[PDB]
Amino acid sequence: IEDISAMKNGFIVVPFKLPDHKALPASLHFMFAKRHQSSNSNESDCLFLVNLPLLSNIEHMKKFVGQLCGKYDTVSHVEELLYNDEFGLHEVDLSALTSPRNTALLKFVDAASINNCWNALKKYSNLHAKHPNELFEWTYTTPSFTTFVNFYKPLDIDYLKEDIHTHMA
C-alpha cells in the first residue's frame, strides 16, 4: 500500500485523501503523473497525468500547486490544464473526418517551475508512508441544484446568433 511511491515505468503517484461524505462511512483517490516527452512547442514544461481527481479543472491544478508551493518552501505557477476531456465531448472530432483516456495534461508556464513542482511531487509522494495524515485532501467541485438544470435551460441567443453569423462569414 504505502510502500509503492514510484511505479515501474516511472509514473510518480499522487496519493490524496477523499473528502468526507454524508452518504459514506480516510478514503483515498489515487493519481499518477510523470514528465511527458514530446517535441511540441506549447507542450513544454507539461506533465501528462493519469487518473485526475473528480470534477477537476484549471482551478484544481492551481490550488493543488498552491498547497505544493506552501509545502516544500518552493515558488511556482501553473499555466493551463491541456485536453482535460472528462466527459469525452472532444474525444472524437467529426468536423475533421468529414472535411490516454481518463488522463490529463497539466502544463506549467516555465521549466523552472515545472522541475521544482515535480521535485515536490516526489517529495509529496513519500507522504504515503511517512505521514499519511499530511496527505492533501481533494476539495472537489459539487454540482448544485441550480447548475444541474443549466444544461436543460435555454442558451443565450446573443452568443449563438452572432457566432452563427460569423460561421456564415
Binding site: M7, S27, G88, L89, L94, T98, N102, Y152, P154
Partner: protein, 1082 residues
C-alpha cells in the same frame, strides 16, 4: 412443394416424438385378456323390479349411479336384470390411432348390451337408461368380485365415471395405480356400456322427437339416447376408412395434436366448458372428407393424399364450411357426404343412416370458438414464409385464462340447493325446462351464456362460461358427483366468464338497440326488458331514433365490466358477484394524465394524444408556407406523442416529463450549396431556422421560442434544436435535415482508420435513427396501430413496467415498443391482443423464452388480412448467422430486432451492454413464472413494478428538490409557463442529467443505468429514483501498468493497479452532493 415437404419432415418426426412402443400395448392388451376372461365368468342373475334393485344394492358395496331424475316406485312398471354382454373394441386402439402422452388417456373398451333385456318402450321415460345405470354397477359388482379373486386389486381400483363427460350414461372406469401390469403404459380402461344398434327406433329417436313424455324438442336427450347405438357401426366405418387412406391415422394424430392445443376433446361442452368436438369427431369428419364433402356431394379431401393434405383441408372445412348458424354437415355410415346449407342454431353434424347429430356434444358457446382458431390454423397452412408446425400444436394455447382470452372474472355461484332456486335465481326451473338439459350443470351454463350475449354481443369474439372445479369422477359406492363447495349444491364450485374482446366495440358507452315505433315492437320488447330504467330514448347523430343505453367510463375497467356485473345481477343470480381484479390494478400502473375526465377516460380514449397533434399541425401550419431563402418541403414530427409511444400522455404546459417536446425532423429543398463540413452543416441549417424563428418572432406571438443543443449525437457538438412552445402548451423540438447528414457520416467512416471506425459508425447510427430512419419508423408506427389499438395501451405501460425496474437508461423506446408489438402482428398461438392485461401478459411470456442467440426478431409491419417476402426475410436471417460468427453468445450483439425497414437488427439495440440484457430477460423469466406458480393476484400484479435492486455493488437512493409529478401532466397542474422561458427547466428531473454524466466518465469501470421518467416512478412525490450499478468483469481482476486503461483505479502494488471502490463511490457522490441522500456499498 416446400410447404408440404418441410411440413412432412416436421410431421413424421413429431409423430416419432410421441411414438407409442409395442411394449406398452403388449401388457395393456394382455391385461384385457384378463379382463375378457374374468368378464366371461360374470354370470346373469334373475330378473327383478326397480324396488328389488335398491334392496340388493343398499347393503352391498356396489351402488347404482342413477342420473337425474332417479327412479320412483310410483312410476316404475318394468323389470331389470344383468346379463352376459358382448364386449368389443372401439376408438383409437381399434383404429391404431393411439400415441404416447404423459398425462394419459382412456382406452374405450366397449361393452354392447343384450338386445332382449330392453323393451320396445325402452327409449322413453328413461327406461333403457335405467337399465344401463343398473347394469354398469352390476357389472362392476361382478368384476370386483372376480378381480379380487385374481388378487389384482392391490394396484387396480374401481370407481364411477361418465362417457364423454355426459351424465346420461353411467359407466365404470378401470385403471392402474403406482403379467397384467399396465401401470408402465399408464393407459386407463374405460368400461363403457352401450346399447344394441337401433334396439329402439332411430326414426323416433331423432333430434326433433322427444323421449320425456309427461313434447318439446330434446336434441341433447336424444343425443345420449341415439348415439348409444352407433358405437359399433360408426367404428366399422373408421375401421375400413383406415384401410382406404394411408394417412388417415397420421392426419388424425395431427388432428389430435392440434385439437388438444386449444382445449378441444371428447369432453362435453354443454356443461359449462370448451369442447364437444375433438379427436372423435375429427376422425369422423376425416371419414366424411375422404368420402366426398361438396354441396352436391363433390370431393373435399382425397383418399390417396398424405398427412399434409388431410390435416389442413378438414380444419379449413371446419373454418370455411359453417355448421353453427349458417349450415350443417351430413354423414352416412351404412352414400357420400353432402353439406346441408340450413342451420339449427347449434352445431349439427347429421348422421343420415343413424339419425343422430354427431356435433350435438358442442354448444353454441363452444362451436364458434373453435372456428376462430380454425381459420387461424388454416391461415398458418397458407403462409409461404414462416414455419407453422410448431405454431399449431407444440405451443400450448390453453394455459392461462388471461392469455387466450381478454378477461376472466370470478362470479361465485352461491345458488344453494335445487328446491331453494325459486329465491336463488330469477329463472323458473321446472321439469319441462329440465327435459333436454336435465343436468343442472348445463341449465345455467347456456342461460348465463345467453344472458351475457345480450350484454356483450359484438363486443367480444366468442362466449366461454367456464365451470371451474367441476370434475367427472365419482365413487361406485356413491351415487354421483356431489360436493358442498362454494356454498351450493351444483356440479361446480362457481362459474367464470371468459371472452376475447374486439377493441373497436368492447368499451362502447352507447349500448345500441332497435328502432322505436308507434307500438312496442317485438325486437324492441326484449331490449327494453333487458335494460328497463337503463333503456331510454336517445337519438342518433344523423337523425335516427332508437332505444339505447349510456354506460359509465372508467380508467380502471372497461364498459363491459359493469355489464358483466349488471346482466349477472338480473337474470343469473341475485347474490352472485362478478369482478375482474386482475385487469383493474393493471390499468393503475400506467400514468394518470392530468386532463379533464381523466378518471372518466377509458384505455381506448386517445383523444388527448391527437389533440396534441392538432397544435403541432397548427405549429407546422405557420412554418410550411413561410418564405425563407430556402423553401421547406418536409414538415413532419418523429416524436413519441404522434406515434403513441410516449410513456406520458400529452398534456399541455407539461414541462417535467422527458417526452414533453415531440421530436421534429424537417427538410428543405435540394441544395448543393450546403457546406461539406460537419460544424458548418449545423451552422447553416440553424440560420434558416433562425429566419424561421424570425418569422415566428415577428407575427406569431402566440408561440414561444428558445434554443438548445442536442447532445444525443456522439462527437457532434454543433447541432441546435429549435424549441417552440405553442399557445395551448405543447412544445416541439425542431431540427432540420438535408442530404448532407448521411454524406458527412459515411465520409467520416471511410476516411478514418481501422482504429476509430466503430465509434463514428455508432454515432452515425445516432444520426441514422434520429434523422435517416426516424420518419420511416414513424410512418408505420401510427399506421399499423389502427388494427390493434391495444398495442398503444400496452407498449406505453410495458415501458412503464420496464422503467420501474431501471431499464430505460440503456434501451430506446422504439426497441421497447417493437418488443410489445411482436404479439400484435404474430399473436400465435394466442388470440388477438385486445387489452392491457392481455397485452402485458403476452409480453411477459414471450420475453421469458426469448433466447437472443438462436432466434432473432423479425416482426412484419403489416395490417390484418407490406411485409418482407420469403427472399427478403431469409436475408434478415442472413444477418443473424454472420453476426454470430464474432458474437455467438450475445455479448456483442444480443437483441436483433428487425423489420421490413431495418433488417440489420441493430438499429435501436446496438451499443447496449449485454449484462443489463441478461437481467432484462431474467426479469421476464421470474415475473411470468410467478403468475403460473403462485397465481395471479394484486399482490403479484403490482410486484412486477417492484424491483429489489439486488446483485448491486452500487445502489444510490436520492430525492430531488421539487417534486415534479404534477408538473409533468400526471394527475395524482400544468397551466402556464413563466415570464422568461429559461426558468421552466427548474422543475425537471435533476437525476436525468446527473446519471447522464455517470455513464459518461465512468463507462469503462461502472455500468450506469437509471430512470428517465422520475415523475411516475417516484411514488407520491414524483421525484424519487434509484440507480443499480455493477462493476465490469475485466476491471474485476488486477490490471497491469498501462496508460489507456481508462479506469479510475488506485495502486495495489508496484506492478498492478486495481479500481478501489472508495474513490469510485465518492466520485458519483461528490457530483450529486445536493442530491446525496443514500448510497449502498458492498
Amino acid at each position: 412443394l416446400f410447404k408440404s415437404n418441410i411440413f412432412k419432415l416436421q410431421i413424421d418426426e413429431l409423430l416419432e416424438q410421441v411414438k407409442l412402443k409395442q411394449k406398452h400395448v403388449l401388457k395393456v392388451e394382455k391385461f384385457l385378456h384378463k379382463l375378457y376372461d374374468i368378464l366371461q365368468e360374470i354370470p346373469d342373475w334373475e330378473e327383478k323390479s326397480l324396488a328389488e334393485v335398491d334392496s340388493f344394492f343398499k347393503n352391498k358395496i356396489v351402488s347404482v349411479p342413477f342420473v337425474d331424475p332417479k327412479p320412483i316406485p310410483q312410476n316404475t312398471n318394468y323389470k331389470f336384470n344383468y346379463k352376459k354382454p358382448d364386449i368389443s373394441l372401439i376408438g383409437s386402439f381399434a383404429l391404431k390411432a393411439g400415441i404416447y402422452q404423459p398425462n394419459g388417456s382412456s382406452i374405450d373398451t366397449l361393452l354392447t348390451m343384450p338386445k332382449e333385456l330392453f323393451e320396445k318402450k325402452d327409449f322413453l321415460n328413461f327406461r333403457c337408461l335405467h337399465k344401463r345405470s343398473v347394469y354398469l354397477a352390476y357389472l362392476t359388482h361382478h368384476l370386483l368380485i372376480l378381480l379380487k379373486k385374481d388378487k389384482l386389486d392391490s394396484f387396480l381400483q374401481l370407481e364411477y365415471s361418465y362417457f364423454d363427460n355426459d351424465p346420461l350414461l353411467p359407466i365404470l372406469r378401470i385403471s392402474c395405480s403406482k403379467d397384467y401390469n399396465f401401470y408402465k403404459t399408464r393407459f386407463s380402461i374405460n368400461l363403457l356400456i352401450g346399447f344394441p344398434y337401433k334396439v329402439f327406433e332411430p326414426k323416433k329417436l331423432l333430434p326433433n322427437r322427444n323421449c320425456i313424455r309427461i313434447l318439446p324438442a330434446t336434441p341433447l336427450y336424444n343425443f345420449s339416447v341415439l348415439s348409444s347405438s352407433t358405437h359399433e357401426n360408426y367404428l366399422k366405418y373408421l375401421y375400413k376408412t383406415k384401410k382406404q387412406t394411408e394417412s388417415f391415422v397420421e392426419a388424425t394424430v395431427l388432428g389430435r395434436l392440434w385439437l388438444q392445443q386449444r382445449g378441444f376433446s371428447s369432453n362435453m361442452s354443454h356443461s359449462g366448458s370448451l369442447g364437444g368436438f375433438g379427436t372423435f369427431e375429427f376422425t369422423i369428419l376425416m371419414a366424411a372428407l375422404l368420402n366426398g364433402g361438396g354441396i352436391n356431394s363433390n370431393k373435399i379431401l382425397l383418399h390417396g393424399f398424405s398427412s399434409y393434405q388431410l390435416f389442413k383441408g378438414v380444419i379449413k372445412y371446419l373454418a370455411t364450411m359453417d355448421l353453427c348458424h349458417d349450415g350443417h354437415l351430413q354423414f352416412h355410415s351404412n352414400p357420400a357426404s353432402k353439406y346441408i346449407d340450413e342451420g339449427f342454431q347449434t352445431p349439427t353434424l347429421f348422421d343420415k343412416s343413424t339419425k343422430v347429430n354427431i356435433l350435438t356434444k358442442m354448444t353454441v358457446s363452444s362451436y364458434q370458438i373453435l372456428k376462430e382458431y380454425a381459420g387461424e390454423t388454416l391461415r398458418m397452412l397458407n403462409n409461404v414464409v414462416q414455419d407453422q408446425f410448431s405454431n399449431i400444436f407444440l405451443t400450448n394455447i390453453s394455459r392461462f385464462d388471461n392469455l387466450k382470452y381478454d378477461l376472466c372474472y370470478d362470479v361465485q355461484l352461491p345458488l344453494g340447493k335445487y328446491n331453494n332456486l325459486e329465491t336463488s335465481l330469477a329463472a323458473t326451473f321446472g321439469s319441462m325446462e329440465r327435459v333436454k338439459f336435465i343436468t343442472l350443470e348445463n341449465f345455467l351454463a347456456h342461460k348465463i351464456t345467453n344472458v351475457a350475449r345480450y350484454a356483450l354481443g359484438d363486443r367480444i369474439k366468442y362466449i366461454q362460461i367456464e365451470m371451474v372445479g367441476q370434475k367427472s369422477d365419482f365413487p361406485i359406492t356413491k351415487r354421483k358427483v356431489y360436493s358442498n363447495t362454494g356454498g351450493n349444491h351444483f356440479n361446480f364450485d362457481f362459474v367464470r366468464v371468459k371472452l376475447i374482446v374486439n377493441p373497436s366495440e368492447c368499451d362502447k358507452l352507447v349500448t345500441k338497440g332497435p328502432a322505436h315505433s308507434e307500438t312496442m315492437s317485438t325486437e324492441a320488447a326484449v331490449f327494453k326488458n333487458f335494460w328497463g330504467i337503463k333503456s331510454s330514448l336517445r337519438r342518433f347523430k344523423d337523425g335516427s331514433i332508437t332505444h339505447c343505453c349510456v354506460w359509465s367510463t372508467s380508467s380502471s375497467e372497461p364498459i363491459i365490466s359493469s355489464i358483466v356485473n349488471f346482466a349477472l345481477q338480473k337474470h343469473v343470480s341475485k347474490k352472485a358477484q362478478i369482478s375482474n381484479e386482475t385487469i383493474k390494478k393493471f390499468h393503475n400502473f400506467l400514468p394518470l394524465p392530468n386532463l379533464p375526465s381523466s378518471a372518466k377516460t377509458s384505455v381506448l380514449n386517445l383523444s388527448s394524444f391527437f389533440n396534441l397533434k392538432k397544435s403541432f399541425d397548427d405549429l407546422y401550419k405557420i412554418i410550411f408556407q413561410m418564405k425563407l431563402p430556402l423553401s421547406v418541403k418536409s414538415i413532419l414530427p418523429v416524436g413519441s406523442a404522434f406515434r403513441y409511444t410516449s410513456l406520458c400522455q400529452p398534456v399541455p404546459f407539461a414541462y417535467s416529463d422527458p417526452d414533453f417536446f415531440q421530436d421534429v425532423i424537417l427538410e428543405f429543398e435540394t441544395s448543393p450549396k450546403w457546406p461539406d463540413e460537419i460544424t458548418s452543416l449545423e451552422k447553416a441549417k440553424t440560420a434558416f431556422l433562425l429566419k424561421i424563428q424570425e418569422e415566428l418572432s415577428a407575427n406569431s406571438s402566440t408561440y414561444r421560442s428558445f434554443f438548445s443543443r442536442d447532445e444525443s449525437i456522439p462527437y457532434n457538438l454543433e447541432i441546435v434544436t429549435l424549441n417552440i412552445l405553442t399557445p395551448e402548451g405543447y412544445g416541439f423540438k425542431f431540427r432540420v435535415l438535408t442530404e448532407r447528414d448521411e454524406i458527412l457520416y459515411l465520409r467520416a467512416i471511410a476516411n478514418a482508420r481501422n482504429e476509430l471506425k466503430p465509434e463514428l459508425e455508432a454515432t452515425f447510427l445516432k444520426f441514422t435513427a434520429k434523422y435517416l430512419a426516424s420518419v420511416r419508423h414513424t410512418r408505420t408506427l401510427e399506421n399499423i396501430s389502427h388494427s390493434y389499438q391495444f398495442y398503444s395501451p400496452v407498449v406505453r405501460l410495458f415501458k412503464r413496467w420496464l422503467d420501474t425496474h431501471l431499464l430505460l437508461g440503456h434501451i430506446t423506446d422504439e426497441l421497447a415498443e417493437l418488443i410489445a408489438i411482436k404479439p400484435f402482428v404474430d399473436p400465435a398461438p394466442y388470440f388477438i391482443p385486445g387489452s392491457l392485461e392481455n397485452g402485458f401478459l403476452k409480453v411477459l411470456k414471450f420475453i421469458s423464452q426469448w433466447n437472443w442467440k438462436d432466434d432473432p426478431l423479425i416482426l412484419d409491419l403489416v395490417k390484418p388480412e407490406e411485409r418482407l417476402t420469403l427472399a427478403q426475410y431469409k436475408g434478415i436471417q442472413m444477418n443473424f448467422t454472420n453476426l454470430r460468427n464474432s458474437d455467438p453468445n450475445g455479448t456483442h450483439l444480443q437483441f436483433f430486432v428487425a423489420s421490413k425497414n431495418d433488417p440489420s437488427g441493430i438499429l435501436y439495440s446496438s451499443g447496449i451492454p449485454l449484462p443489463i440484457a441478461t437481467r432484462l430477460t431474467a426479469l421476464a423469466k421470474v415475473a411470468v413464472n410467478l403468475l403460473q406458480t403462485h397465481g395471479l393476484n394484486q399482490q403479484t400484479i403490482n410486484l412486477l413494478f417492484t424491483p429489489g435492486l439486488k446483485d448491486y455493488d452500487f445502489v444510490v437512493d436520492l430525492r430531488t428538490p421539487i417534486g415534479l409529478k404534477s408538473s409533468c401532466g400526471i394527475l395524482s397542474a400544468p397551466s402556464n409557463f413563466p415570464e422568461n422561458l429559461n426558468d421552466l427547466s427548474e422543475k425537471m428531473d435533476p437525476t436525468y442529467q446527473l446519471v447522464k454524466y455517470l455513464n459518461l466518465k465512468y463507462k469503462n469501470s461502472l455500468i450506469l443505468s437509471s430512470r428517465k421518467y422520475i415523475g411516475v416512478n417516484g411514488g407520491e412525490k414524483g421525484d424519487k429514483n434509484v440507480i443499480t450499478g455493477l462493476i465490469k468483469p475485466l476491471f474485476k481482476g488486477a490490471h497491469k501498468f498501462r496508460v489507456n486503461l481508462d479506469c479510475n483505479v488506485k495502486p495495489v502494488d508496484d506492478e498492478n493497479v486495481i479500481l478501489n471502490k472508495e474513490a469510485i463511490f465518492h466520485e458519483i457522490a461528490a457530483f450529486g452532493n445536493d442530491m446525496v441522500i443514500n448510497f449502498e456499498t458492498d
